């Protein structure tokens, strides 16, 4: 039934943004309401998305899914019957080149800055002692353009890190950290590392048990004429799949 509600959307730094919407408002409607509330230009809306996440005790975010066009975010979150789930606004492109468009606007730039800062703070981005010194300086100095330009050069800038999970490559039940970005999946074995190029994935599938446990399996071209299925077991399997699809999509738009 259509009725007006207040919705909390969090930014990357935990600042809360409250918007008035209808229960029957869809994802795009809510997104537009948030953007309106923040004074974000219309022409940047396509650069950001809303995500459903679970907040853990330590305040870190486990990404659950990107909200799709047909969804009703209020329903989406309330129907889960858990206060741990939050809607988050975050940049939704992969090529850091698009940062150029976003940084032309002050509010866009603030959003990108906030999420980059949080990415470093949560250890998603890997830096050296000197870089850490500089970064920590700009933070105080708040130039932000320069801060972002520096951040763009950092390892795994623009990547999404997932909660520790397991995979069956190279061995069964191996503990792994998965990260998605720059058209690949990075697997850190927490140390040896693997890179699974999206263009080398013939397909992927999200599976669930029955007599919970979610898996993402992709059929990977390991070498010439040799395909091998790789399976990652993770509660964020769907988010990983969404990311694979999203990266492929971005590649299609770019290719065209």
């Amino acid at each position: 039934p259509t009725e007006e509600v207040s919705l909390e959307v969090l930014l990357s730094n935990g600042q809360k943004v409250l918007v008035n919407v209808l229960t029957s408002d869809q994802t795009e409607d809510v997104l537009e309401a948030v953007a309106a509330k923040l004074d974000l230009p219309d022409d940047l809306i396509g650069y950001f998305s809303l995500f459903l996440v679970r907040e853990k005790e330590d305040g870190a975010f486990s990404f659950v899914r990107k909200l799709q066009e047909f969804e009703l975010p209020y329903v989406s979150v309330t129907s889960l019957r858990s206060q741990e789930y939050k809607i988050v606004l975050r940049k939704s492109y992969w090529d850091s080149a698009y940062d150029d468009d976003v940084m032309e606007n002050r509010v866009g730039l603030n959003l990108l800055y906030a999420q980059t800062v949080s990415d470093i703070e949560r250890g998603w981005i890997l830096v050296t002692k000197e870089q850490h010194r500089q970064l920590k300086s700009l933070q105080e100095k708040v130039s932000k353009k320069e801060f972002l330009r520096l951040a763009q050069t950092l390892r795994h800038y623009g990547y999404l890190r997932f909660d520790a999970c397991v995979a069956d490559f190279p061995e069964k039940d191996c503990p792994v950290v998965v990260s998605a970005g720059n058209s690949e999946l990075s697997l850190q074995l927490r140390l040896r590392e693997g890179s699974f190029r999206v263009t080398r994935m013939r397909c992927w599938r999200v599976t669930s048990s029955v007599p919970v446990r979610l898996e993402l399996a992709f059929e990977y071209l390991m070498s010439k004429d040799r395909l091998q299925w790789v399976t990652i077991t993770s509660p964020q399997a769907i988010m990983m799949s969404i990311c694979l699809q999203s990266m492929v999509d971005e590649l299609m738009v770019k290719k065209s």
Binding site: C203, W204, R205, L221
Partner: peptide, 10 residues
């Protein structure tokens, strides 16, 4: 079942 990746092989 498994959705084919349109970019696969290139």
């Amino acid at each position: 079942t498994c959705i084919y990746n349109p970019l696969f092989g290139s």
